[PDB]
Symmetry: D2
Subunit: 338 residues, 4 copies
Amino acid sequence: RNVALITGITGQDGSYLAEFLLEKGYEVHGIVRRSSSFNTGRIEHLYNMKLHYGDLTDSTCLVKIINEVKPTEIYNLGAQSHVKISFDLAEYTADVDGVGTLRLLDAVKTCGLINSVKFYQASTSELYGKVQEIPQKETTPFYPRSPYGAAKLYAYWIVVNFREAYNLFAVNGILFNHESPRRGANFVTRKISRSVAKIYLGQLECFSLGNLDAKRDWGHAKDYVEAMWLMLQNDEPEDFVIATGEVHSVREFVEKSFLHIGKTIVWEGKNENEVGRCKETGKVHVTVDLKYYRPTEVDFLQGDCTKAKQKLNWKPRVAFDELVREMVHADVELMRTN
Amino acid sequence: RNVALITGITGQDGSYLAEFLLEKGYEVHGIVRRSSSFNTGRIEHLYNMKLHYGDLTDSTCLVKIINEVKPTEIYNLGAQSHVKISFDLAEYTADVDGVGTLRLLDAVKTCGLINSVKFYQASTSELYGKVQEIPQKETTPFYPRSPYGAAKLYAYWIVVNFREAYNLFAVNGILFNHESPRRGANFVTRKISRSVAKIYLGQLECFSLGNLDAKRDWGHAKDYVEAMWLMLQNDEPEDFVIATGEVHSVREFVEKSFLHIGKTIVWEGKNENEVGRCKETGKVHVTVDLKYYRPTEVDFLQGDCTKAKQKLNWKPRVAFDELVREMVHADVELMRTN
Amino acid sequence: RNVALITGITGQDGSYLAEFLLEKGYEVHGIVRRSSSFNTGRIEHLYNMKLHYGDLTDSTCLVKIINEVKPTEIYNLGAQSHVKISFDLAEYTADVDGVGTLRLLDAVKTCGLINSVKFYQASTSELYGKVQEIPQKETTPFYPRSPYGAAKLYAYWIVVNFREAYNLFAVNGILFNHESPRRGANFVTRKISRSVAKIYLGQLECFSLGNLDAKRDWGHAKDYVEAMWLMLQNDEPEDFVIATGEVHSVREFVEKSFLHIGKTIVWEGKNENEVGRCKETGKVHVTVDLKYYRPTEVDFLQGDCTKAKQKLNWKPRVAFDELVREMVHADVELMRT
Amino acid sequence: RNVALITGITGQDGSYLAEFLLEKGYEVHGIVRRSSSFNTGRIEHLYNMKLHYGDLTDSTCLVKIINEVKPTEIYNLGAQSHVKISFDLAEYTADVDGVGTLRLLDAVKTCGLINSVKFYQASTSELYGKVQEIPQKETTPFYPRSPYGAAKLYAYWIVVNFREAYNLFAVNGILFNHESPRRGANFVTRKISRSVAKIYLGQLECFSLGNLDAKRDWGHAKDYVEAMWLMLQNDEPEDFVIATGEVHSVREFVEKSFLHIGKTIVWEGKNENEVGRCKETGKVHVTVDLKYYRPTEVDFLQGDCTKAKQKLNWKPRVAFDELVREMVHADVELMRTN
Ligand SMILES: NC(=O)C1=CN([C@@H]2O[C@H](COP(=O)(O)OP(=O)(O)OC[C@H]3O[C@@H](n4cnc5c(N)ncnc54)[C@H](OP(=O)(O)O)[C@@H]3O)[C@@H](O)[C@H]2O)C=CC1
Ligand SMILES: NC(=O)C1=CN([C@@H]2O[C@H](COP(=O)(O)OP(=O)(O)OC[C@H]3O[C@@H](n4cnc5c(N)ncnc54)[C@H](OP(=O)(O)O)[C@@H]3O)[C@@H](O)[C@H]2O)C=CC1
Ligand SMILES: NC(=O)C1=CN([C@@H]2O[C@H](COP(=O)(O)OP(=O)(O)OC[C@H]3O[C@@H](n4cnc5c(N)ncnc54)[C@H](OP(=O)(O)O)[C@@H]3O)[C@@H](O)[C@H]2O)C=CC1
Ligand SMILES: NC(=O)C1=CN([C@@H]2O[C@H](COP(=O)(O)OP(=O)(O)OC[C@H]3O[C@@H](n4cnc5c(N)ncnc54)[C@H](OP(=O)(O)O)[C@@H]3O)[C@@H](O)[C@H]2O)C=CC1
Ligand SMILES: Nc1nc2c(ncn2[C@@H]2O[C@H](COP(=O)(O)OP(=O)(O)O)[C@@H](O)[C@H]2O)c(=O)[nH]1
Ligand SMILES: Nc1nc2c(ncn2[C@@H]2O[C@H](COP(=O)(O)OP(=O)(O)O)[C@@H](O)[C@H]2O)c(=O)[nH]1
Ligand SMILES: Nc1nc2c(ncn2[C@@H]2O[C@H](COP(=O)(O)OP(=O)(O)O)[C@@H](O)[C@H]2O)c(=O)[nH]1
Ligand SMILES: Nc1nc2c(ncn2[C@@H]2O[C@H](COP(=O)(O)OP(=O)(O)O)[C@@H](O)[C@H]2O)c(=O)[nH]1
């Protein structure tokens, strides 16, 4: 008996995880938000999958779904997951990402499955914020830098408390940034690949970004959902960092993406006046707008996943250069039909 | 200076109202929910229009948006608007549709606009529920029949209270059911037009409905948004019913719809056993499934818009027959493209 | 098996209801809010009674409590119950009085007791607000006049909806104003009795009120909680107005309270400048301050409780004059200490 | 000139802090919760103090109060502060202690006072939970052990975020346990001093406790509120541990309290069967009940306040022995009356 309940199923990770579990024969249930428009685009092709309307801010609907499903595994991937947006939607972010994790854990307990279900919490490298060690590992002290990070830090600890207080098998996946052709358009990587594709297809000339110098450890979401499953197959509930260990800047993501389009970006200027120009035509394709900057930036992330490699036999499979090429090519094809 | 702020701008009505106001030279602002997927499909062609991330359950976010926008007219169309879904998402529905209306009124008062802004609240014929008079007018006593109805009733009265307590120009548009080619696919009219369109195209053979006997007063959303604006142009803030005054059953909507694709439906059986088959080929095209029924149904609605005619000089332009035709043709063209 | 769960057990009504049910041999459980200070003053003498920490804004705590208690009767009396206060705490009032009622109903359902518990909702005459008929009865249309009234109106209908959708035995008691020596200090009657008692004791010289001309139908809370239990004893779940049918103004409550400490108030002036002065001593003891007015007043309330008299055989025992005397005498004794 | 706004003014710390600030000539404002009973007992003798009704879960009321008061200093002491209660009131504790801190910070920002107010957050040694270093200091990593600790940890970091993101002068006082004759009756120290006083007076014979072996750093609340004010007088906003650095067990607090009433307690038995019996009379005066234990105990706390001592010139004045004597003596006088 393998029955998974995935909150956040319509999102990037939930769509890949649903495919991964379905491939292993699981009965997969997802919680979907009511929307005035179609919002199951990433999982429509899958429709052993059953969807249920619900919301992490509504405790009763969570108890009803859990009681009906009686899941053996629960992956809480549901979240307002964008950092910039969390600065103006701070309360909504706390209620969903923080208190919502509590509501889900308490629904499991109310449903009497405290000793039967395994629970995965979608923790994040954003918890390290202004990093206290480089690279960051499980024992590196957290230092959140946004309402999103603080809300996720509450969720990380309430999951630890349910594990310690009630013996729930619950684990925190401390995942560093992971992208894919399904990444939300609002994250920097997908914003770049979509924009570069458009410029290639002549649908766009230039686009603006915020902080070009931010440095990230970027992996492919498909590889990372496999780590979530591996953490719930472990004999004991443990928390793990999952990451690539390699760092690149936003500037580098931009340069490599344009290379796939046949253009070489040359940078000129500083700060909000810096621009990215085609080395040949001299045409400006990238500009900077402070409106995209964060009040308290997270300047650098680099994860050390030695524990996961040794205990779960997990490892990144897709590297940075291949990730970038895949996203640009996927968006060129997508935009082609536009 | 005409600056409108529309909550629920990505929904059916918000998309038509944005068009209507843009056409009048308004500066239009909309509050959009953060989503992991693209969710501005109904208004993307409008890109005079400014969108702001927000949520009716986050008070500060509404204050920030209203201070930045400084609107002269606010239309609160945002809501979890589906009745059936409200039974399992009762709390979220009360928080968004009921308390959210107060959050928006309180943001207005906090932003110092109580004496300058005009506020439109999206009330609804669902307030009459188990109807206390036929037809229903502004003075017919309410009798909600779902968590949605109850939440909208709290919103109706908190709006009346800000009007009476603080002289805010605030009104309740008590609109009866209105549809269009942009209607959510989950509502009965669009579920029928889309399903009939697929059958015609050979992309579907049969679909199931819930209660065939329910009767509704159905108008076209494009006509009704005009009445919203007119209420905000009236000299005094008053509440108004907006409706066609004509009633049809779900069964008749089904019949007229198949008629537009050259099929005549004949019914057999009763209750959940009843079926709809092509009178010419005898093929079953419509079945019933209890899962679509509601615990406490709203059997009948017929609205009386005499007051709106007298003070607004308003009257519906599209009638029932034209509405069904338009939706079925629209969906045949949409399904044909994919 | 008689097990009652009372939300709002520390408040006026909850305290009288808990006593009434304990006298009938019920096992009584109440939900109490965590407080930094002692807050069980009204029910300490009762401590058959068990208390549980909880809050109507925390869903899980309500499920936990109900699951443990398995009550046969639930009385939802918990609420931010003050009208003036609701204008400045309109959202908290909505969340506790409106959504909190839904939270308790869903907890019942979640716990599998939808068919085994009888539920009483503390509805109110404030629902009639700007009254649409006089007197007001079960069928008089509602017209709320404050964030409190709107929130209680939502509660009223969500209770009807659980009754209609799921066959829960749930009832709305539409109670008109009821007071007692246990009434909160900031309601008008207790404000007047405590202030009049302090004046008699030489602890105060004068106090200010708001709208002296408001009219109310005032009963005694001890009489009204009996009606709540009667509603749950009824064969079918029905809604009932509970009231005295007699009206008095705030001004009359003031006059009668002063007569009980040996003073005759004589009014002079108008509106915010009106004052009540002692006939014998010539001292001003009552003034008016607009800060006590409500933006949208409820001018008049008079309940018709024919239905309850007929079906429940309920009748109020304490009349207005006796309520005033009891409140003033009790506060004179209370303030002496 | 000097205007303080204190949330949690009716509690133990708020009552002492109000007195400390009134002595310095401050105009002191407090936020008090609406209650069906008198709830201002600790501050009624103060009657330059003004009270405002409000709740940390209602943002509109906080904006209204901060606008009216325009404080130069805000002390956020308001909280559901009991650890045991937080296990069954986890969501309410999160909404008040965690999110409520965000609401108060956002209200300061909405009110335009981000650059003029100084903000003190009531952080706590419970943040160290399962302690990662002994003694604990500012740089010791947090490890919360209850819904109260997780909620306070969200609050600690959202305060840090407003300081860094918006230059708010905001500080976290990481205070270790502090008690007084005004401590809440449900906390262990006051439970013991009240019970022992009743025993001395003949009003009680025995009482039950939970975990006798817990160890704590106990100081006197009057000394500690002085530190809160000192942190807001510092030139730069910094976080500080405030504590005595001396540690005792619950068992020693029981033993010393009984000594003040002329009794020597002798322990017998183990775990939930352990009892404390009078050496002279052999009467049992203390028993153990597992219902007072916590699922995840905080076994030991010892604070290192070296930073505060050096930068603020603060030092604890009341030592443990005197704290116990004062509390038992005050409770004997209190109970003598009734
Ligand atoms: N991707 C990354 O690089 C990293 C992500 N994370 C975290 O991992 C998880 C997965 O991330 P990812 O797939 O990219 O995120 P997405 O933003 O793509 O997806 C978020 C999901 O959560 C749902 N959701 C949001 N709010 C609610 C709510 N109130 N109730 C129920 N569901 C809700 C969304 O639904 P809807 O479609 O309706 O919006 C969507 O299904 C998230 O928790 C994210 O914070 C952790 C480390 C790094
Ligand atoms: N249409 C009808 O027949 C009738 C409708 N009404 C009411 O009129 C209004 C418009 O109806 P209609 O356009 O059909 O409804 P839709 O369901 O099409 O649109 C609802 C809108 O509200 C938004 N919304 C939902 N929840 C929130 C939230 N928490 N915060 C912010 N925005 C939110 C939706 O966003 P998203 O796209 O992200 O879901 C969408 O923009 C609604 O209030 C509805 O209840 C009244 C009478 C009859
Ligand atoms: N009395 C009247 O004249 C009328 C009253 N009513 C209603 O009847 C009920 C009883 O009234 P009455 O006793 O005078 O009211 P009180 O104000 O004296 O008592 C209210 C009770 O509700 C509790 N409460 C408030 N908020 C919450 C919350 N969030 N969670 C849990 N409990 C909460 C209070 O606790 P705490 O002590 O912690 O504040 C108290 O126990 C109320 O619902 C009131 O609205 C109806 C008709 C008329
Ligand atoms: N004392 C200690 O040993 C330690 C305490 N702390 C923290 O320091 C602060 C002061 O502690 P202490 O005085 O002992 O605590 P108390 O429990 O004595 O006081 C708590 C205060 O918060 C108020 N409050 C609770 N909930 C709300 C709400 N929703 N809205 C508004 N006000 C509310 C209480 O009001 P009401 O009277 O109505 O309940 C009371 O005024 C708290 O934040 C506590 O968590 C930090 C370190 C150690
Ligand atoms: N989303 C986003 N990030 C940007 C942009 N320009 C630069 N960045 C930076 O890119 C980094 C990664 O951002 P994002 O993809 O949102 O993921 P995060 O690591 O979860 O914040 C951060 O340092 C952002 O500030 C932009 O336009 N959008
Ligand atoms: N949404 C929906 N309604 C259905 C269906 N079958 C019958 N109905 C009924 O059609 C009526 C209109 O439903 P809907 O379009 O959702 O709008 P409402 O009037 O706001 O409930 C109600 O009485 C429904 O019970 C169905 O499959 N879906
Ligand atoms: N609470 C209160 N009510 C007052 C005061 N002065 C006049 N009233 C009026 O007395 C009536 C009853 O108020 P209250 O006892 O609060 O009960 P309500 O009927 O629940 O509002 C209302 O019309 C109030 O406006 C005053 O100082 N306090
Ligand atoms: N409140 C309380 N704590 C107890 C009791 N018996 C032992 N303790 C322990 O004493 C310690 C202090 O508890 P408390 O005074 O509530 O403060 P905390 O340090 O904020 O939990 C904790 O380890 C409790 O488990 C008891 O009966 N009540």
